[PDB]
């Protein structure tokens, strides 16, 4: 065929049927030449193993990048607190790792690590030291945020945000050139570490998926099968997303489930195993780099009791209640950024948000602590070996009020800041903030339950289930349940979320609680809206995304969505013969239609095929270059084989999808979703009457939603 | 390396003596309560009880990996900053891709920041 | 509409589009009446929660039945060995559970448990005692097999076989009335225990899915939404299958993955969480009954080393090599049962197979031991506490030859007997025999590797990876890898299998080995055929199953598959008007067509709709009963509103799927698979030319396969 | 119940004394090496080492559940066998369902055993 045929412009949807046709044609061509020569056999073998090789490379790259990002973020987050002069490349934990000056009260206290006050003022303690630590923390947060936003803006503007919504749109057939490119990969890799160091209310777990999605895309250029076909490239992208989730949470099964449930519009059977293998390889790479078998390991000796489900369900009620609120809040803010004037100053907005976050976080120990480290601490149980402040009250009698107040203040601060942090022009993840909020809520609930059980053990439930004066209630489990509930409420993921939490915890004994909590949260979220945060952002950005939930009215019919309608003039049509190249070029230039139907005759209106505008222009230009005399006067004939008429039957889709005008849109939407059609041709009495494009369906659904 | 490995252990407060920490660089077989704790405050009859109460762990870290990752990340960040400075100050087949990417980045920067709305 | 419209005959495929249309119409009707009255609101609330209630009931029933089946099978399997006179209801382990006469050498030795020789002959040891034990074991196996086969034949002979192939066919839209009924449920529940007790080379894990699939079906009759719609019922069946796998292996995540990957042709997003919840509930029920947190718990202290992957891959080579062989062997036998004369005597065949199995199994201790118990023993590591014969050699120096010979004999016996056991007319599972074969192979490989490492520690690989004179090699892990490889080779499941094995083991540190082994096995199996054992049995039974793997030739077009063709007369067509009821009845009786197209006129051949034969006859009979004077002379008009003409527009599909004759079958198959169409109407120039039914596609694919 | 619970340990062969088993009915707090093993063959200085070498586990079983499940399964099997015998010997809205099921099972039994090929 003519070079460039079958390609698409930026910000356009792909035709899955045509992609499958091209893939099958290429497979036939490759397999036909296998017997021709040994080199052809080797090429065919490479083509067969192209999927395995690309998934392996994507997993390796994702694991390496995740390990590097984690290590760099851990190293930089402690630069705000102080510096290790002896080894500038060691964070607070690593600098104090091998020091014998440690103390039981302070595990990370050793003379090697010097706080900024000691570096400049020269005193480790005192009002001046505290003031200088405050100022240096603020300055470092501002510097990191400014560097991240500047790098995002200058080099890869697409690196901002989690990227899960855009990945969801892309995997549905949308095209965003440069989103999954090398520049975006590098810039997001650097800026994720920078933003996590800045201390903003965001995470690097969810965004890592984008990183993975980038790597595979790049690797898709090393294999012609996946470089030339968009559907195969999107399958590779789904595998990359699974690997990214796996490295983010160390949950290969959870990553595969997330890919299947959230981001993959189409998930063939082979993609399941390919994604699983890629995720496993990436997890192996991370385990061979980062450790220096679970991240949020927990040890709840007491098995969870049945009555504890009731508090857990309560956490679910919270998890949804915040979730929906966030969806109502963040979007309300994000839309404002797209409508008000503060969106014209992204760098200033990021700097101000970082300033506020650091200023309000430094005074409170929980907020100052890293969000991932805060979740780690909240997930641990209280015991004689531990010396966390949260457990102080337990050691005092068995201040609880002070700890509860601090936790509540941290929860309020994180809830308020996550709304203003998500959507800014830096790589921002929603998993870590939501998990931290839910963990704080669950820790508070568990502390309350423990206090009730200890002080009121006379109650029949506690006495029967719990031995008097026993540590049956584990606040760590409550924090885990709260984190899972909040994540489910904000994202609405149900099975992938539970499996990811279980893998990131390693505890299979708490599957039933988590699930239940998640369920509750989801339902509560669905009470205030069935759209998740990612889907809400997709709608806000106006991406052409079609979801199974969206449905049309029963009365609506195909005739009500046909493009020609009444006011619009007759839809562009190409005659089979007796038509000049100049006419085709003029029609292409005049109209923005993605494609044009072809009819036997203007009066007959008997359908022949569909000619895409891009293919039309590419073929016309290539024919003009190759063959002399094509000056626009030569006629163009689409019929099967002096003027040397141009032959355009190759670029013609001889089997355009056709539906009847009386067919309800209820079935048209189902056809579009299942088959991934880009356009359908509504016919009546065997002739062409109109065209219904995926854009028309999306516009109708958006209008109906706006009316609501 | 002596920095890569350690063996440390933590004892909770037993009777009069409060909880304490003891670390030293030994191999796995040497890492134990009696060897690590020297001297041990607890009396003779309670020595073993203290050992059970205390928890000793031997750990190993890859300092070289952290070193290399930090160094490469810092070099990449510095190169990116220098290239940015050259772009904003000095600039006013590889080259062709470079200007094509410059036009592309101008486009996407207009799309993401100036408008925030690429609806297609 | 007329009562009975929308139903299907036995052994027919459902139209998924029509089922979705009916479901949406019912949803509209239910939601429209919500404001009418409070009782309507309660009915709507019940309808909304119908899915949750049905999945909960299915999970509870599946868990209870799985626990009962497991306990009964465990109790009966030991009846062959002996009896506990003091408590006839205790197996060998339970009878000896609280006895102080136990010994270290014999854990289950106590005077309470009496072997049949002691009961009759009166001596626990001696040639006569051994002979009598042999005879009684054979007699009990024969009695159990005869009772199982007789119960299957008399009451619910659909209970034979695993049922996974038939479940796969049903979930694709096929209808088998009585397969998932109450009679089948009860008979399979009893006969699974009976067959497992008989000692035949089969399992009760895979077949349990059928049990679950039955329960939900019954519960689907308690909810109108799922009782009236076939697609919703099939979603409930998918959830039931997930719960069944969960109870079989205690793997709710594994059960969901198996449902998604193997048995569910269509798996909506909601079905994922519904199946997960049902599986979790069923697992909870099983954990609340059977224990009296993992079944095949293992303790491999030494972490798996990288070089151990190479032996594991070898096991994969075995796993596939046997797998394909079994697919080639069992089918070859099964086809013979359908072609030779020994299939006319199912009871005799079952009795003979049981006789041979018992006779050859009793002499060898491993074969005599229960297959599940054999897998349990093989999965354990060797240590000072254990006293298994397999580890005797390790205690002797550190007879290995005797243990290896016994394991090889057991492997050969199981491999030979599984071919002749699968397919007989009793509930037979393939998971347990395949896992046992793979476990024996892996145990042999691990013993060989341990011997090589100990005797030849000078080798650089062993010396570097393993400390000299250390138990680094764990034969239990090798047995687990071999079992996983064999199961993957025989079933070709990739991710669901790995997750099921991990959950049934509880060890997350061995995910990478298992996966790799599975991959190898699958590939090796794919080298000798891409069809699994379940798909092979589906093809053997001739069920109308369409799979994504099957594809047509490029040259093939729709015109080559249209029903009318050339030799066949013109396809039946109904005129819009001027047509009598007698003509319609005569056409219905004469032709076996599932449906008839409707045209405006005979000459015009302008399509109007599609009238299903069942709906046609039901409507005609109902109209005759309701309205007097319909004696066949009255004309039938399908057009929109003295003879009182019958109105049949309600039963007419006003939007029958239409394709062009030039459209390649490559796209027709994709449309049929994605949309689950039951028929398509091939048209040319806007008129009706032919009909392509799913039966035609299946027949063409079967013919092409037969030619190969 | 005394039958439901038990506590037993197994000791591997230590020096001269071979491995041994000891079981008794006690509570969890009583279940330990010293209490369960009485007398213990090992000498005075090796008593503690023997305790580490040995492993005592406290277990509980639900005898009532196994009782009930076995009883109900046996009753169901006996009822099924009696109904079968009645069908083959005695027989030659509930009744209507019974005869409809009889016809259905006859037809589907013909499909399964007689032919094995119910292709549609
Ligand atoms: C340690 C710390 C961790 C760091 C993380 C490392 C992993 C990152 C991968 C390395 C990539 C490197 C980035 C090269 C830019 C690129 O190579 O950028 C292409 C434009 O020239 C150029 O080299 C411009 C280079 C100007 C100077 C470079 C200075 C160097 C900076 C200092 C640090 C570098 C160290 C990295 C080592 C690793 C344009 O390529 P792109 O960036 O891919 O953007 C579009 C997209 O790929 C579309 O893809 P899609 O449709 O699938 O979405 C295509 O279709 C379009 O193709 P077109 O050119 O025909 O329009 C294409 O432009
Ligand atoms: C403890 C040990 C563990 C045991 C396991 C317990 C769980 C099992 C569930 C209990 C079911 C019980 C089985 C009742 C037969 C049934 O009730 O059988 C229907 C035919 O009359 C009859 O009662 C005949 C009853 C003659 C005497 C019964 C003696 C009793 C025997 C002694 C033991 C009983 C104890 C069980 C307690 C639990 C026909 O019903 P079916 O068995 O459902 O077969 C067809 C299918 O359901 C299609 O479904 P599909 O299209 O979805 O595939 C429908 O559509 C067709 O409907 P149609 O009648 O209009 O043709 C339908 O016949
Ligand atoms: C083209 C892309 C996919 C290649 C990416 C290769 C990456 C994954 C490779 C390059 C260098 C590798 C590392 C090199 C050395 C070691 C030390 C060893 O004790 C564990 C593995 C580990 C930590 C490797 C992990 C994988 C690694 C990071
Ligand atoms: C944006 C990111 C990548 C930049 C990170 C650079 C950091 C690590 C640099 C910037 C300024 C540096 C400090 C500048 C001056 C001194 C004084 C010297 O006697 C010891 C090192 C010390 C204390 C440096 C430590 C490292 C330091 C904090
Ligand atoms: C209509 C169908 C779905 C109902 C099925 C209900 C089943 C699942 C119910 C009925 C009786 C129940 C059991 C009754 C008593 C006990 C003892 C308790 O210590 C643990 C739960 C356990 C073991 C229950 C498990 C669930 C159970 C088996
Ligand atoms: C097909 C299945 C369900 C039938 C199971 C019934 C079994 C358990 C029955 C059948 C025959 C029975 C035996 C028949 C006779 C005796 C002698 C008596 O002094 C003690 C019980 C004893 C030893 C019985 C034990 C239980 C027994 C083995
Ligand atoms: Cl995140
Ligand atoms: Cl995110
Ligand atoms: Cl099985
Ligand atoms: Cl099976």
Numbering used by the authors:
A (entry chain A), C (entry chain C): 78 to 369, 374 to 479, 495 to 737, 745 to 811
B (entry chain B), D (entry chain D): 23 to 114, 156 to 183
What did the authors write?
Five members of the CLC family of Cl− channels and Cl−/H+ exchangers, ClC-3, ClC-4, ClC-5, ClC-6 and ClC-7, have critical roles in endosomes and lysosomes, catalyzing the exchange of two Cl− ions for one H+ ion2,10–12. We recently found that the ClC-3, ClC-4 and ClC-5 clade of endosomal CLC transporters requires the accessory β-subunit TMEM9, which we refer to as T9A or its closely related homolog TMEM9B (T9B) for proper activity in cells and animals. To resolve the mechanism by which T9A and T9B regulate the activity of ClC-3, ClC-4 and ClC-5, we determined structures of ClC-3 alone and in complex with T9A, finding that T9A occludes the Cl− ion pathway and that inhibition requires the endolysosomal signaling lipid phosphatidylinositol 3,5-bisphosphate (PtdIns(3,5)P2). Each ClC-3 protomer comprises a cytosolic N-terminal domain (NTD), a transmembrane domain (TMD) and a cytosolic domain (CD).
We identified a two-fold symmetric class in which the luminal domain (LD), TMD and CD of both T9A protomers are resolved, which we call ClC-3/T9A. To distinguish this fourth class from the structure of ClC-3 determined in the absence of T9A, we call this class ClC-3/noT9A. Because of its completeness, we focus our discussion primarily on ClC-3/T9A, which achieved a resolution of 2.9 Å with C2 symmetry imposed. In ClC-3/T9A, T9A wraps around ClC-3, interacting with the luminal, transmembrane and cytosolic faces of the ClC-3 TMD. The T9A LD interacts primarily with the ClC-3 helix B insertion, forming both polar and nonpolar interactions, including the embedding of F181 of ClC-3 into a hydrophobic groove on T9A and an extended π-stacking interaction between R28 and R83 of T9A with W174 of ClC-3. The single membrane-spanning helix of T9A, helix H3, extends along the periphery of the ClC-3 TMD, forming interactions with helices B, C, E and I of ClC-3. The T9A CD consists of the H4 helix that extends along the cytosolic face of the ClC-3 TMD and four residues at the extreme C terminus, which we define as the CTD. Whereas both entrances of the Cl− ion pathway are solvent accessible in the absence of T9A, the CDs of T9A constrict the cytosolic entrances to the Cl− pathway in ClC-3/T9A to a minimum radius of 0.9 Å, which is too narrow to accommodate a Cl− ion. We, therefore, assign ClC-3/T9A as an inhibited state, with the T9A CD forming the gate. In ClC-3/T9A, PtdIns(3,5)P2 interacts with both ClC-3 and the T9A CD. Thus, PtdIns(3,5)P2 appears to serve as a bridge between ClC-3 and the T9A CD, raising the possibility that PtdIns(3,5)P2 influences the equilibrium between the bound and unbound states of the T9A CD to regulate ClC-3 activity.
